[PDB]
Symmetry: C3
């Protein structure tokens, strides 16, 4: 047969092209799970940054308080140095 | 009559061959459209690999920041302790001076 | 007739191919449903790209802030060393006054 041979060839190409397509979808189905994992990886990093930001803000506030206290203690140390300047050589 | 018997088999098998061809064309079209999308979705395999590495990098950056913040917190706590101790000493010196003036 | 027999046999052959073609069309329909489902991943990957872009800028900012905090702590420690020297001198002066 001349035309039957032409159809068998086209059908074989069809089956082959469909089979190759089905293999790719099975491969791409894994990306659904990998995307779920990455979504959770980002969720975790966002909470780690949330915590770091709180800690850094608290540290900044502590540094500002320490600086202010030290300035006012130095005022008192200088006063004490001047008082002793009047008394002991 | 034997012409009509013949015309019928020619038309029957012709209609079957035409329906086949139209259906094969639909098949090829549907397959071609499907192949275009998979080529497009194959890029996501590489993009997911890049994102995995991007997260791996950010986790190590957070690991380092957490160590640095913990060290800074420890230093602040020690500084606060030292300042509390020095405050006790400044107050004692203030009282000693007042005792000299009141003498 | 030999010819009428081959005309019917090649006709039978095409009906068998039509059945196979129908199996194919069903297999392509199932495949098309999956691609529509996987098209959502294109958007999800775009969202994740942006999520990482945001986290990188948050880390950039934290690193600057932590470096600035570290510098401030080092300066405070250095100033405390000098204040300690002064308190100790004042304590020694007072001990000398009260021992006199
Ligand atoms: Cl201090
Ligand atoms: Cl003092």
């Amino acid at each position: 047969g001349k035309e039957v041979e032409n159809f068998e060839k086209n059908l074989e190409e069809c089956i082959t092209r469909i089979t190759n397509t089905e293999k790719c979808l099975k491969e791409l189905m894994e990306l659904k799970t990998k995307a779920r994992e990455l979504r959770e990886e980002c969720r975790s990093l966002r909470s780690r940054c949330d915590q770091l930001e709180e800690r850094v803000s608290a540290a900044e506030d502590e540094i500002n308080e320490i600086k202010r206290e030290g300035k006012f203690r130095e005022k008192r140390i200088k006063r004490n140095e001047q008082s002793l300047q009047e008394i002991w050589d």
